[PDB]
Design a binder for this molecule. Structure first.
Ligand SMILES: Nc1ncnc2c1ncn2[C@@H]1O[C@H](COP(=O)(O)OP(=O)(O)O)[C@@H](O)[C@H]1O
Ligand SMILES: [Mg+2]
Ligand SMILES: [Mg+2]
Length: 390
């Protein structure tokens, strides 16, 4: 892989905020970015050097992208793997379609992570309605109460149903149109962490500090780095687990592995994203090389960057709910960005999305300071200001 050098065209399939932040990282280093995204108002397309407005399976546009670009990546975990494989006929694609196919499918993903030597949650695979019908209630009850999750196309807790007995499992599967699913035992979670790694085609890799993540209603709310409740041993285990998965997968790119720490202290792998991750946004303001720059480096065959964290950090997600302080049925109110910007620790990142909607990710604020407790305190003050907390 002769390295792809500054000045070249780099392709990005998907045009959300992750693709937008990739654009800034690539363009700062002198690359040009072509974004393929069907939406006219794409956050990434708005800043890309070129936006191909097309469906992710459009043959002509895929051909155009691969002809223009020396290397192509994605920011969209649910992208069709066949689109990445089509692109790889004529250009370098990182991560490869085969890797994305494993990570985007909960059944394949749990099997693969287990086969890497990493513990996953107790679960029952439900391949089809016919298969579920043949399972006895005891086999379901062994992982109940639990969560029925669609194997494909879930994000932000969607495609998931709580289930408390075998009958609810069967009704839930019908409610999900009978698609393949995983039934996971609900575990007693003490805290959640994510390991962020980048891996080059050579097998070289870098790892970030462990991020400690808090979710509300299944959506990431904030991230604290380095994880205050993760001992050096656990940090080491979680990092090695992500690297073992990435090595076995032949993964080239940025990989984020989410973990549970249970009340008994055990580490359980939840899922992985074949891309930069919401819980890695802090790297932009806290680390030498951001996760977006690692994606550039991995896909170009350039050396991976240093992951040194120069400042402790907290990321606070900004959902569209913040625009509705008087409730969703009342008019939107522009959030107090002038008061956020008056906070010394605050690094404001807004995605350029036109319409604020509840549940929609509109931005994030990174808080950096000399000490983690100063950053945590600032993020709490900002959360109260925005009515994220009381
Ligand atoms: N087996 C489980 N036990 C307990 N909590 C869980 C389990 N699976 C998921 N959760 C909770 O729900 C959140 C979202 O589930 P996850 O499968 O990660 O959804 P998504 O893929 O949409 O991000 C997790 O971060 C975790 O807090
Ligand atoms: Mg996944
Ligand atoms: Mg998750």
């Amino acid at each position: 892989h002769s390295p792809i050098l500054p000045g070249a065209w780099l392709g990005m399939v998907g045009g959300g905020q992750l693709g937008r932040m990739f654009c800034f990282a690539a363009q700062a280093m002198g690359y040009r970015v072509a974004v393929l995204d069907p939406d006219e108002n794409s956050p990434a397309g708005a800043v890309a050097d070129r936006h191909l407005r097309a469906a992710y399976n459009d043959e002509a546009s895929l051909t155009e992208l691969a002809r223009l670009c020396a290397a192509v990546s994605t920011e969209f975990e649910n992208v069709p793997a066949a689109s990445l494989d089509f692109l790889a006929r004529t250009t370098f694609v990182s991560p490869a379609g085969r890797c994305v196919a494993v990570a985007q499918d909960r059944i394949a993903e749990k099997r693969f992570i287990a086969s890497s030597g990493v513990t996953v949650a107790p679960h029952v695979v439900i391949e089809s309605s016919d298969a579920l019908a043949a399972l006895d209630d005891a086999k379901l009850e062994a992982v109940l109460p639990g969560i029925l999750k669609t194997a494909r196309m879930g994000y932000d807790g969607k495609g998931q149903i709580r289930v408390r007995n075998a009958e609810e499992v069967r009704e839930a599967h019908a409610s999900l149109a009978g698609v393949p699913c995983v039934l996971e035992k609900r575990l007693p979670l003490k805290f959640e962490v994510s390991a962020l790694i980048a891996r080059a085609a050579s097998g070289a890799s870098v790892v970030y500090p462990l991020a400690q993540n808090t979710h509300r209603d299944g959506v990431l709310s904030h991230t604290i780095v380095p994880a205050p409740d993760a001992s050096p041993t656990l940090v080491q285990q979680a990092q090695q687990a992500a690297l073992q998965i990435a090595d076995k997968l032949g993964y080239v790119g940025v990989l984020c592995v989410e973990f549970f720490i249970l009340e008994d202290g055990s580490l359980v792998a939840n899922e992985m994203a074949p891309r930069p991750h919401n819980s890695g946004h802090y790297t932009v303001d806290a680390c030498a090389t951001s996760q977006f720059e690692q994606q550039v480096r991995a896909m170009t065959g350039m050396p991976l960057g240093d992951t040194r964290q120069h400042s402790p950090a907290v990321m606070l997600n900004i959902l569209g709910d913040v625009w509705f302080p008087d409730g969703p049925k009342r008019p939107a109110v522009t959030p107090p960005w002038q008061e956020v910007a008056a906070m010394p620790a605050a690094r404001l990142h807004l995605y350029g999305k036109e319409e604020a909607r509840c549940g929609r990710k509109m931005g994030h604020v990174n808080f950096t300071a000399a000490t983690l407790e100063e950053a945590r305190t600032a993020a709490r003050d900002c959360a109260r200001l925005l009515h994220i907390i009381t």
